[PDB]
């Protein structure tokens, strides 16, 4: 399987395969970690320029991604890999054949939840150790305690408490002592998403029937409930710019924004990501910024910004709708044909079964543009089956020819 002439380098044209992306900050630079098959990529949020790519491909696909300053944790099969600038530093191997599902890192604790409702806890060897490596203990949730594990969360100002969220209800474990400190009341609807709020002791829970629940753990009771009938929540996120805003992503591909202060809908971004590919898989506000990053399974990553209000007074009322800021994307289906665009090896042309022709950059800028199909005078075209390009006369006239499936003519394109 190993070549003596070739070795894989990276992948061009993938931003995200649908696994939720992880965010973090290095000093003043925000970064976004996205899974692309058996390797991950780190972008700079300010410019969406590629910073690091994982050195090697994992043996299996990555199921989870967690990012903590300089260290990126990637879970695949029964192993969790710890990477720094894309280089594998330490590999954690769990003792059970059960595959990892979810991942939470707080302080010196690393928590991994398997498909068999077992939670593995790891701790740092030394308080100054950079990542947890040692095996601390094992905590397993049984059917009597709760349902299948939905996500692992940690609330701020909780000493050694891990807020396990299951389909049935929420559970609180003290990882140090491994005991069930608190069990939540059963919920009628299946929980699908969990998001800690920027407030103390409240965690937002998203259900399968368009319900968002800001559950207070300390008081152990419901505080507020937003209704989204005929919808399924896929992502939740709170704005930390000083505005009590909540962004709710749905599997239908829509992203709604609520003003918790005024109990009203600010705006809805319709069909930002395809419903067929899972809608909005992940949507997160950047910490302290009016910028929200959104991702989906359709191979697209977008950023929207909330501009300052245009009203000198009552700006909280008059909220500018979110404005598209920048994005990276690619084909929604595997590319059918490829070609190197120029002799310098700076760009590549690509055609896929999604009936789109794309140009991808081979540099860190990671730029990507779909060539316009708007026709000259004098739905997408069928999939390309053959393509030829020249550069002798680029800028003078057409320099590309393509053949389309079940079509009796060939089309020309101008690079």
């Amino acid at each position: 399987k190993n070549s003596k002439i070739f070795s894989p380098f990276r992948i061009i044209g993938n931003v995200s395969n649908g696994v939720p992306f992880a965010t973090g900050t290095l000093g003043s630079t925000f970064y976004i970690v996205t899974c692309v098959g058996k390797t991950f990529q780190i972008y700079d949020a300010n410019t969406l320029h590629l910073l690091f790519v994982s050195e090697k491909e994992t043996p299996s696909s990555i199921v989870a991604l967690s990012a903590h300053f300089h260290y990126v944790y990637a879970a695949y099969e029964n192993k969790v890999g710890i990477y720094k600038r894309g280089i594998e530093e330490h590999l954690l191997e769990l003792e059970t054949d059960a595959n990892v599902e979810h991942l939470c890192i707080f302080g010196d604790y690393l928590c991994a939840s398997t498909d068999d409702n077992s939670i593995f806890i790891y701790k740092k060897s030394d308080p100054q150790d950079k990542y947890p490596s040692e095996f601390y203990t094992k905590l397993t949730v049984t059917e009597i305690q709760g349902g299948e594990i939905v996500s692992l969360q940690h609330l701020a100002t909780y000493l050694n408490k891990l807020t396990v969220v299951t389909k049935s209800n929420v559970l609180l474990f003290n990882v140090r002592t491994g005991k069930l400190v608190f069990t939540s009341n059963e919920f009628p609807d299946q929980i699908t998403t969990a998001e800690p709020a920027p407030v103390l002791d409240i965690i937002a829970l998203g259900t399968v029937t368009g319900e968002v629940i800001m559950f207070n753990m300390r008081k152990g009771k419901r505080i507020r409930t937003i209704k989204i009938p005929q919808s399924r929540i896929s992502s939740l996120s709170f704005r930390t710019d000083g505005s009590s805003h909540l962004s709710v992503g749905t599997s239908s591909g829509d992203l709604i924004f609520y003003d918790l202060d005024r109990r009203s809908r600010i705006h809805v971004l319709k069909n930002i990501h395809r419903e067929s590919y899972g809608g909005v898989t992940q949507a997160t506000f950047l910490n302290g910024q009016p910028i929200i990053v959104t991702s989906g399974g359709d191979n697209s990553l977008k950023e929207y910004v909330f501009d300052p209000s245009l009203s000198q007074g009552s700006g909280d009322v008059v909220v500018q709708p979110p404005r598209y800021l920048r994005s990276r994307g690619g084909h929604s289906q595997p590319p059918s044909y490829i070609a190197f665009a120029d002799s310098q090896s700076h760009f590549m042309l690509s055609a896929s079964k999604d009936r789109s022709l794309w140009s991808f950059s081979l540099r860190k800028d990671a730029q990507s543009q779909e060539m316009s199909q708007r026709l000259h005078k004098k739905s997408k075209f069928p999939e390309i089956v053959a393509l030829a390009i020249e550069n002798a006369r680029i800028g003078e006239w057409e320099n590309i020819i393509t053949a389309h499936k079940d079509e009796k003519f060939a089309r020309t394109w101008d690079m």
């Binding site: 290095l26 000093g27 690091f52 300089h70 720094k84």
Partner: peptide, 14 residues
Amino acid sequence: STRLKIVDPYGGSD
């Protein structure tokens, strides 16, 4: 002091 502590993608790991 006498020493910049820069946390960047290329440094500041420690």
